[PDB]
C-alpha cells in the first residue's frame, strides 16, 4: 500500500491516455497527471522544476544537460515525434525554392525549439542553408512577449534580433518584414489567411519520406524526465517509467490496429497503418535507445553544430544508465 | 438534480471529451462505459442495457423499420469510413472483383453495418449481386456467433453456418472460401497466409474515386436513446446530438494542432489536409443535411439487401427534433 506520490506531467495522447486512465499503472508509484500543452509544459519545467516526471523539450533539455545542471534525467520515451518538414511556412510570393532563404529574415518564437533544431538541420543538410546565412527573428506567434525559455551561449556569427515590441511573427510575417517561420506550430489563423503564406514544402509527405529513405532519422520532439534527486533515491524508478509509458503506447497501438471503428478522426487510417509500417518499419514510433539510434545520433551532432551544446554529446551519455536495454523472452 | 443516464460509445478521440467530464450533457449526470462495437451492439439490441448508446446503423434499421427497436436514433456518426478495406480474397483465385460471381464469401454476421457498405461495392461497380454469392457465417476470433436479430431474408440468399469449430478466419487461410467480409480483418493466423489480402490493391485510390461518384462517406454507427426517454423528455435528443457534436469539434481542434501530434501516426497534418481537400472542411460530419447523400444511400442499400421490412424515408431515420440545429 505503500507507494511514491509523484506528479506526471504529459500531453494528452492516444499513447498516453492508457496511463491517465489507470489502465497502465507505474510500478510503485500513485501517479498525479496533469496534461498540458508542450508550451506550458516546458516553460514551467525548465523554469520553476514544477514536476517529479516530465515531457520535456529535447532540445531544452540537451542545453541544460550539456552542462550538467539539469535538474532531470532523461529516459528514451519519445512522447513526441514528427517530421518538421511541415514546420516550415514561408512567403510562396518571395521563395520559390528552399535554397533562397540565404540570407533572408526568418522568424521563430525561441531559438532552442526542438523543431527549429530538425528545420534548421533540414535547411543546412540539404540546401546549404546555415544558421549563420539567416536574419533570425524571435516573438510569439499567438502572443508577442516570448523568452528564450533558458539562456544560450551561441556562436556570435548567429544574428538574432527581437521582433518590434508588439507584433508577433505570425504578423510579422503577414506584413512581410520576415520571409520565413519556423515553430512547432503554424502562424496564427490572421496569418494564415494571407494566399502568400504556406509550406515551404509543396509535398511535405514526399520530400519527409524521402528524407527518412536518405536518413532514417524519425525526428524526435519530446524526451521523458525525472528529477536527478529522484532517480538516485529510487534505481529503479527510470525503468518503471520507461516501462508504463511504452506499455501505455503498445495499448494505444493495439486499439489503433483495429479497424472496427477507427480511434482517430480520420478517413483511412487501415491505410495509413500499414502505409507507416512500410516506410519507417513496423514498430514506426519506437521508444528505446537502439530502436532510435540513427536520429539520436544525429540529434547530437545537430544540437551541437546549431551551437546549444556544451561540447558535442554522446548518444551514451543522453539517458539515465538504466534505460539503454530492456530484457526479453 | 439532472437525469441519472447509462452512455456507451466507444473510445475514440472523439468521445474522450465526453468521457472526461470536457464537455457535459444539458441536464444530465452521465455513467459512461466505453464498449468495442461487438460488445456494445449485442448488449444494445438483446438486453436493452444503455439509456443512450452507441449503435449498429444497420441492426438500429433493420428493428426500426419493423417500428419495434427499444432505442431511436439521432445523427451522430461517431462511426464513418469506407469499407474498401472490408474486403479480403484469397488473391491466387481472385485477380479482379468480378471472378467472386458463384464463389463462398465468409462473414461474421449477414447484417452487419459494414458488410452492408460492401455488399453494395460488389452490386454497384461489379454485378456482384447478394444471390450471386454462397455466403458462410461464422465468427472472425471465435467460431460460435448469432445474428444479433432475426431476420427474414428473401429466398435468393444462399447463406450457411460455418463448418463447426471453425472460423471465418480459418476457412480463408485453408481456402475453403475465395472472400471474406466484415468490420475487421481476418484473425492474424489467418493473415500470414501470403495469399490473402486486400481485393483492392488501392483501396485508399477506389475509395477517393467512389466518394467523387457518389458523396458517400459511409456511416457503421449512430448514437439511440430510449424511446420512453425520448418522448418524457423533449429536449434530451437535441441535448444529446450537441454534446457529442461539441466532443468532436473539442478533438478535431486538438488534433489539428502540430505542437505533438494527438495520435501515433506520421504525416498528421498532410492527412487532415487531404482529408478536408477530398471530403469537406467538416469531414467527419455529424448532422442529416450535412450527410444526405450518404443517408439516402444506406436506406436503399439496407432494403435492397433484405435488411428493412418497410420503405425507409431518411426523414424518419431520426427524433424529428434532430433535423437541423440552430445557427448564428
Ligand atoms: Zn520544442
Ligand atoms: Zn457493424
Given at each position: 500500500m505503500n507507494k511514491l506520490r509523484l506528479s506526471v506531467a504529459m500531453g494528452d495522447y492516444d499513447r498516453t491516455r492508457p496511463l491517465y486512465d489507470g489502465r497502465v499503472q507505474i510500478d510503485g508509484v500513485d501517479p498525479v497527471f496533469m496534461l498540458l500543452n508542450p508550451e506550458e509544459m516546458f516553460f514551467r519545467a525548465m523554469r520553476?522544476?514544477?514536476?517529479?516526471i516530465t515531457e520535456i523539450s529535447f532540445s531544452s533539455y540537451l542545453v541544460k544537460h550539456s552542462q550538467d545542471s539539469c535538474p532531470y534525467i532523461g529516459i528514451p520515451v519519445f512522447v513526441s515525434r514528427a517530421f518538421?518538414?511541415?514546420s516550415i511556412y514561408v512567403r510562396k510570393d518571395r521563395i520559390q525554392?528552399?535554397?533562397?532563404?540565404?540570407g533572408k529574415r526568418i522568424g521563430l518564437?525561441?531559438?532552442?525549439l526542438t523543431a527549429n533544431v530538425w528545420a534548421r538541420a533540414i535547411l543546412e543538410a540539404?540546401?546549404?542553408?546555415?544558421?549563420?546565412?539567416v536574419h533570425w527573428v524571435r516573438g510569439g506567434?499567438?502572443?508577442?512577449a516570448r523568452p528564450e525559455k533558458i539562456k544560450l551561449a551561441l556562436p556570435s556569427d548567429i544574428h538574432i534580433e527581437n521582433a518590434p515590441?508588439?507584433?508577433?511573427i505570425s504578423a510579422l510575417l503577414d506584413r512581410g518584414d520576415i520571409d520565413g517561420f519556423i515553430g512547432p506550430r503554424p502562424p496564427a489563423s490572421t496569418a494564415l489567411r494571407?494566399?502568400?503564406?504556406?509550406?515551404?514544402?509543396?509535398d511535405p509527405t514526399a520530400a519527409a519520406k524521402d528524407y527518412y529513405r536518405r536518413t532514417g532519422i524519425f525526428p524526435i520532439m519530446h524526451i521523458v524526465g525525472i528529477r536527478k534527486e529522484l532517480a538516485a533515491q529510487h534505481p529503479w524508478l527510470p525503468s518503471a517509467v520507461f516501462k508504463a509509458f511504452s506499455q501505455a503506447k503498445q495499448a494505444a497501438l493495439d486499439l489503433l490496429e483495429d479497424?472496427?471503428?477507427?480511434?482517430?478522426?480520420?478517413?483511412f487510417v487501415e491505410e495509413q497503418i500499414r502505409a507507416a509500417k512500410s516506410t519507417?518499419?513496423?514498430?514506426?514510433w519506437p521508444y528505446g535507445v537502439a530502436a532510435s539510434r540513427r536520429t539520436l545520433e544525429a540529434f547530437v551532432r545537430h544540437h551541437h553544430a546549431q551551437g546549444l551544446?556544451?561540447?558535442?554529446?554522446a548518444v551514451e551519455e543522453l539517458?539515465?544508465?538504466?534505460?539503454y536495454e530492456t530484457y526479453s523472452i
Open positions: 520553476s522544476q514544477d514536476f517529479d518538421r518538414h511541415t525554392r528552399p535554397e533562397d532563404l540565404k518564437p525561441e531559438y532552442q540539404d540546401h546549404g542553408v546555415r544558421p549563420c546565412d506567434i499567438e502572443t508577442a515590441e508588439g507584433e508577433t494571407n494566399p502568400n503564406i504556406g509550406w515551404l514544402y509543396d479497424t472496427s471503428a477507427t480511434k482517430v478522426t480520420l478517413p519507417l518499419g513496423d514498430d514506426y551544446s556544451a561540447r558535442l554529446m539517458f539515465h544508465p538504466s534505460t
